[PDB]
Design an enzyme around this catalytic site. Structure first.
Site, mmCIF file in Angstrom:
data_model
loop_
_atom_site.group_PDB
_atom_site.id
_atom_site.type_symbol
_atom_site.label_atom_id
_atom_site.label_comp_id
_atom_site.label_asym_id
_atom_site.label_seq_id
_atom_site.Cartn_x
_atom_site.Cartn_y
_atom_site.Cartn_z
ATOM 1 C CG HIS A 39 -3.204 -5.298 1.834
ATOM 2 N ND1 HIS A 39 -2.439 -5.849 2.839
ATOM 3 C CD2 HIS A 39 -2.451 -4.311 1.290
ATOM 4 C CE1 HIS A 39 -1.275 -5.228 2.895
ATOM 5 N NE2 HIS A 39 -1.260 -4.284 1.972
ATOM 6 C CG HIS A 70 2.387 -6.555 3.814
ATOM 7 N ND1 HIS A 70 2.349 -6.838 5.163
ATOM 8 C CD2 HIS A 70 2.315 -5.202 3.710
ATOM 9 C CE1 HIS A 70 2.243 -5.710 5.844
ATOM 10 N NE2 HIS A 70 2.238 -4.703 4.986
ATOM 11 N N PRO A 71 0.157 -8.888 0.255
ATOM 12 C CG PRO A 71 -1.977 -8.406 -0.628
ATOM 13 C CD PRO A 71 -0.967 -7.950 0.430
#
Ligand SMILES: Cc1cc2nc3c(=O)[nH]c(=O)nc-3n(C[C@H](O)[C@H](O)[C@H](O)COP(=O)(O)OP(=O)(O)OC[C@H]3O[C@@H](n4cnc5c(N)ncnc54)[C@H](O)[C@@H]3O)c2cc1C
Ligand SMILES: *[C@@H]1O[C@H](CO)[C@@H](O)[C@H](O)[C@H]1NC(C)=O
Ligand SMILES: *[C@@H]1O[C@H](CO)[C@@H](O)[C@H](O)[C@H]1NC(C)=O
Ligand SMILES: *[C@@H]1O[C@H](CO)[C@@H](O)[C@H](O)[C@H]1NC(C)=O
Ligand SMILES: *[C@@H]1O[C@H](CO)[C@@H](O)[C@H](O)[C@H]1NC(C)=O
Ligand SMILES: *[C@@H]1O[C@H](CO)[C@@H](O)[C@H](O)[C@H]1NC(C)=O
Ligand SMILES: *[C@@H]1O[C@H](CO)[C@@H](O)[C@H](O)[C@H]1NC(C)=O
Ligand SMILES: *[C@@H]1O[C@H](CO)[C@@H](O)[C@H](O)[C@H]1NC(C)=O
Ligand SMILES: *[C@@H]1O[C@H](CO)[C@@H](O)[C@H](O)[C@H]1NC(C)=O
Ligand SMILES: CC1(C)OCc2cc(C=O)ccc2O1
Length: 514
Positions: free
Chosen positions: A455, A493-494
């Site tokens: 991430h 969780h982008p």
């Protein structure tokens, strides 16, 4: 406001072209660089009103069918990187293996499918004057297209019961929101295991206004001579020949090439620190000391248990969220070729049997590094990147807390059936790799066994390189929209946030212009 089970929609291929096609050269209203998580929704959105060219260095996902199922997730990481594959391998200067996408749809074509909305406090924390109602309507536009409520998976249910038993409360049921507690979140794998991705949002663009060029490797942003403006790009095709495209009137170039590709391209175009660029004999077009600075990678720390009876593979859908650590677990079949970057190095023991990967993510993070050029001329040569994992002690202290929490999780009744020996302690589990071990030994565990959560973000921050409208400061007609733009994760969780952000900024450009 959720999507159905259905095949991956490739209708948009009717306006996808090989970059060898010189009839693509010419003038457009908008050029979007990078057909990824943010770039695809951004280009589709702009094409409702204007002529858009979308340029993507990778090819189309049909070329690599294992990108289209949950089952194929590991395959793409196991596949060798020959320069054409959807997964591009790299190693940070910290020595940690990692990957990024090289494919139309970007990282949503290779990722683990977990969908979540931004922490609702994230917006005021930025200080941007967000149109919050528009943000939520844009989330629904994405979710309606590609997000589903996942079906039960036995391991995910076990892990959810354990998170709760271990005190990660409350029980939030099914929810897309990033909130403290344990929940089932959305997924971009549907209930049939078919992957849905950002490329499918190209189907929402106007087929008369949107053109997509694939295997288009954008080498340089072009500027006016004067009032400094971006006016176009140079890109080369898969044969090596060169091509030019321009914007016109009040149009704009937007960089959506990712944490790694966006600062790389800005530097190669002479936008970056005056001292660094001069030392490379790159002409400075716009000095800015922060291009390639403040680049972040949230740590992944983990344990692997080998239950004595087989467990079913599962995709991650159940999240355990605290302010200072985000936790999940996947269960996986064994393998004799390792998925690159799952473990931080290639010399890591292989599982003989089914295993559960139990994981904690440090938020932020606070530690940062930078992206620098390797070649001063060739965009296909990967830049150097360093993340300086755990250089900031607050990150270490949070990994310590997270690791203790995974200890509590291993001690729950929910997990007891997966021990090899019916003993009182957690040494009753069989472990692949280092087990959990005071304070000093958890610090050493955190430092020695860290991996990437994948991430990574930053390198072109709002407030450092960009203004509140994602404009590159000092330069007209140039914007950046992708994960290079924020210094902290919007949630665990982008992809959800960056899918949304593509369309949102597109709508803001349409509004300003009108
Ligand atoms: C293995 C993995 C698993 C992940 N799993 C999850 C998950 O389960 N849930 C989640 O929420 N997030 C997950 N993520 C993270 C998330 O998917 C990414 O952070 C996000 O998608 C990146 O958005 P982006 O638009 O910045 O990048 P991308 O989606 O990578 O978009 C950048 C695009 O630009 C292209 N490009 C780059 N340079 C050029 C150039 N010069 N010319 C043309 N095109 C160029 C790239 O090929 C790429 O297609 C995962 C990441 C990885 C690597
Ligand atoms: C489920 O996936 C299979 C295999 O890819 C496919 O053949 C089938 O049509 C899918 N089912 C539905 C309802 O789309
Ligand atoms: C584009 O054309 C070249 C031949 O000139 C070919 O090698 C390449 O595979 C093509 N790419 C795509 C995505 O069709
Ligand atoms: C946006 O949706 C979130 C839920 O994801 C909700 O908490 C918030 O109140 C909404 N904001 C607005 C402005 O409607
Ligand atoms: C899963 O939850 C579903 C909700 O659709 C319900 O039918 C059932 O209780 C559970 N199914 C299984 C197989 O455990
Ligand atoms: C930059 O160019 C000058 C000559 O103009 C040369 O002396 C110097 O070594 C060059 N540096 C690099 C890194 O190419
Ligand atoms: C959400 O963000 C706020 C402000 O940045 C922070 O205080 C809080 O810890 C975050 N919540 C979660 C559950 O991560
Ligand atoms: C370019 O990458 C190589 C190999 O990854 C690395 O060893 C080298 O130091 C880099 N060169 C520059 C000039 O950054
Ligand atoms: C860690 O980051 C904080 C917040 O950004 C910063 O103030 C501090 O200087 C850093 N601490 C260390 C020990 O580097
Ligand atoms: C948390 C995380 C990273 O999510 C996805 C994942 C996939 C596999 C498949 O081989 C293995 C482990 C794993 O764990």
């Amino acid at each position: 406001h959720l999507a159905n089970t259905s095949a991956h929609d490739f209708s948009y291929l009717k306006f996808v072209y090989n970059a060898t096609d010189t009839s693509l050269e010419g003038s457009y209203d908008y050029i979007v660089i990078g057909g990824g998580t943010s770039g695809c929704p951004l280009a589709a959105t702009l094409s409702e009103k204007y002529k858009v060219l979308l340029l993507e260095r990778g090819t189309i996902a049909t070329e690599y069918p294992n990108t289209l199922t949950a089952d194929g997730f590991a395959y793409n990481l196991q596949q060798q990187d020959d320069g054409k594959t959807p997964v591009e391998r790299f190693v940070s200067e910290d020595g940690i293996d990692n990957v990024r996408a090289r494919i139309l749809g970007g990282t949503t074509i290779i990722n683990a499918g977990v969908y979540a909305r931004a922490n609702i406090s994230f917006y005021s924390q930025t200080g941007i004057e967000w149109d919050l109602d528009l943000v939520n309507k844009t989330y629904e536009w994405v979710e309606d297209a590609i997000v589903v409520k996942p079906n039960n998976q036995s391991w995910q249910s076990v892990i959810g019961e354990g998170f709760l038993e271990a005190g990660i409360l409350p029980d939030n049921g099914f929810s897309l929101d990033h909130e403290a507690g344990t929940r089932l979140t959305g997924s971009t794998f549907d209930n049939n295991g078919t992957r849905h991705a950002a490329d499918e949002l190209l189907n929402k663009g106007d087929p008369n206004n949107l053109l997509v060029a694939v295997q288009a490797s954008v080498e340089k942003i072009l500027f006016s001579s004067n009032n400094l403006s971006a006016i176009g790009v140079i890109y080369t095709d898969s044969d090596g020949n060169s091509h030019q495209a321009f914007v016109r009137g009040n149009g704009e170039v937007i960089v959506s090439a990712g944490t790694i590709g966006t600062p790389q391209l800005l530097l190669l175009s002479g936008v970056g620190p005056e001292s660094y660029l001069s030392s490379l004999n790159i002409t400075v077009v716009q000095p800015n000391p922060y291009v390639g600075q403040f680049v972040y990678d949230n740590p992944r720390n983990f344990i692997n248990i080998l239950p004595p009876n087989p467990i079913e593979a599962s995709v991650v859908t159940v999240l355990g969220i605290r302010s200072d650590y985000y936790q999940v677990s996947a269960s996986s079949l064994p393998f004799s070729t390792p998925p690159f970057s799952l473990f931080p190095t290639t010399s890591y023991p292989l599982p003989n049997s089914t295993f559960a990967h139990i994981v904690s993510q440090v938020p932020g993070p606070l530690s940062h590094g930078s992206v620098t050029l390797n070649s001063s001329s060739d965009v296909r040569i990967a830049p150097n990147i360093k993340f300086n994992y755990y250089s900031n002690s607050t990150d270490l202290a949070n990994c310590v807390s997270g690791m203790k929490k995974l200890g509590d999780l291993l001690r729950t009744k929910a997990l007891e059936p997966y021990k090899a020996r019916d003993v009182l302690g957690i040494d009753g589990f069989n472990y692949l790799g280092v087990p959990l071990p005071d304070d000093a030994s958890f610090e050493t565990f955190c430092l020695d066994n860290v991996a990437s959560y994948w991430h990574y973000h930053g390198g072109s921050l709002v407030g450092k390189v960009l203004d509140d409208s994602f404009r590159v400061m000092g330069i007209k007609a140039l914007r950046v929209v992708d994960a290079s733009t924020f210094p902290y994760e919007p949630n665990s969780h982008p992809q959800g946030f960056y899918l949304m952000l593509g369309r949102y900024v597109g709508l803001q450009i349409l509004q300003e212009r009108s």
